[PDB]
Symmetry: D2
Subunit: 185 residues, 4 copies
């Protein structure tokens, strides 16, 4: 890829979300590998977007339509928003706050990408078939070249991860290992 | 029993055009999805509610297409002459609102959101081909935009039953109410 | 004026017979149509995209905005010629037809999609009205990151004062403002 | 008599920050706009309704800025240390919603639309500086997006009275109800 026009987008690597990584990769693996990607991006001056999801205590910013399998409006834990230490977060990283699965709606992600001259996104995080996938589908329609770092993603189960990796992502992205991405940058 | 408020409900029919029918594989056939969508559309028309017939495609030069590299690209072949044709069983009428999209999701680059909001629609009944591709990209977008979603499960098909079922079991329940055509017709 | 011709497109706002009566000044409808036609002929000869934007609504006005405002437009039956392109535009099959339902040409259209997927980074903008639909389109285009060039003598507003206020105080901050002959010389 | 449902209305205060105040030429002074906007905000807070405090600016590297060539560019100067500061009369409190924008209009690249829709807001009262620049770009967007708009005329100011008046007289009436702060306070 063209490294000079590539950004890293890291979905929801925050302590509140890590317990939801059931497979195939552990939360610690996803975090370590996202951290390694971020260090490579920073060495070449390419933007690193660290996305987190959540709501105020009153859930005012949340979607509330009726659905068959709703998520409960529970009091979020104290650590909900905390980036894990092993991610290696630093001040130059661009923090994005989202209020639903996809990282574009209601955020500055697109603005930041376009104004920084980015045409390619490397995407990783949790969950592969939920927020990662909503973000990917949007990114592709917006015209960005997409790369999915397969071994820096995880989902509720290996099966749900693999179904997206095998059937959705190949049509909208290049699916690559962290190692392959590091070699291309 | 499902109940819908007809006056704030629209039908959105994804890519039921002759060019796309071959891509259906299961667990409902293309013809089954088309016939069911036509019955849904008949009910919406009898209720005076909007029917959105969405179709996807590009000009001969493919200028409107996404061309980013992907692992499993679709060939830029000449489109068959029937590509855009509505199957007769949809019962297409002049009052149906034709939406033209250039990728999977039916919002980007279209007037779908404009039409829904300006017509006072808060609920979409969604159907078409493919369950986990354009139907799903549309649904994910519509949910984030705040619309209530009802998926007509048996008026959707994907490349395989496994792929349809994965979305119906793991994605759609979190963003929609998943119901049968029977249940939806009974609710309108 | 320095333009990359290969990444430049022409966007012509609402030069349709129903809208021409609204050209009040300082340029006439004939001025705007003639000079938009000159621009379009140059873009076509260069193989660059020409977007012809038109505005309107179905008979039921279902696509129209209906919020309360102080000065609403009446929902009258549109004249038979409302949508017609003036002959002097030289409309051809390769021109890209954009249909909008309000002032700006982006909301609810494929204009952005078309520009980006065609590799366009620069827009030459003209049409009616300078401070209404042309300006809403311009403000949007600039926020979206497109380089903007306004063809000052191919725009008109309800009055010269309204046109001039935008040309003097708004457009210079978001665009390069040039005459049609200056733009033709740059392509 | 101006009709508002306070509980589906929000206040959007554009760029009342110390960096921007010096640009208020007329017809209302910076202090007047701040004090009057503060009166609006107090009223909205007393109704339990969202107050959106919008501010404009860029990081030290201007990475978020628009950089296209224009005839009258703004210089890439180091922003003064007071650039982002809310004046005290606004009554900024923890429950106010801070919006950071990177250009004239307050929707592109922000959560403004998300916040309005998810909070059940259908009407915006708009004020701030400058009437025909950031306020107007926000207003044009809001109207196209389908929100009802009310402009608080005497809580806006522009580089000149001529520039303010032109928008108040010729743009805003077509997209908004234009009213005074006193009229708006009485309607809420």
């Amino acid at each position: 890829l063209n490294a000079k026009t590539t950004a890293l987008v890291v979905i929801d690597l925050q302590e509140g979300i890590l317990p939801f990584a059931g497979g195939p990769h552990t939360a610690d693996e996803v975090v370590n590998r996202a951290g390694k990607l971020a260090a490579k991006f920073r060495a070449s001056g390419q933007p690193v977007f660290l996305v987190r999801v959540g709501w105020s205590a009153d859930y005012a910013e949340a979607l509330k339509q009726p659905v068959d399998a709703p998520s409960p409006a529970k009091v979020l834990p104290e650590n909900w928003w905390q980036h894990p230490a092993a991610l290696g977060t630093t001040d130059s990283d661009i923090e994005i706050i989202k209020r639903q699965w996809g990282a574009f709606y209601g955020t500055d992600l697109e603005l930041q990408l376009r104004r920084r001259g980015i045409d390619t996104i490397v995407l990783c995080g949790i969950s592969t078939n939920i927020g990662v996938e909503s973000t990917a589908r949007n990114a592709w329609e917006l015209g960005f070249n997409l790369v999915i770092a397969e071994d820096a993603c995880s989902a509720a189960s290996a099966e749900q991860h693999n179904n997206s990796i095998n059937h959705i992502y190949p049509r909208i992205a290049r699916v690559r290992s962290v190692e392959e991405i590091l070699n291309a940058l």
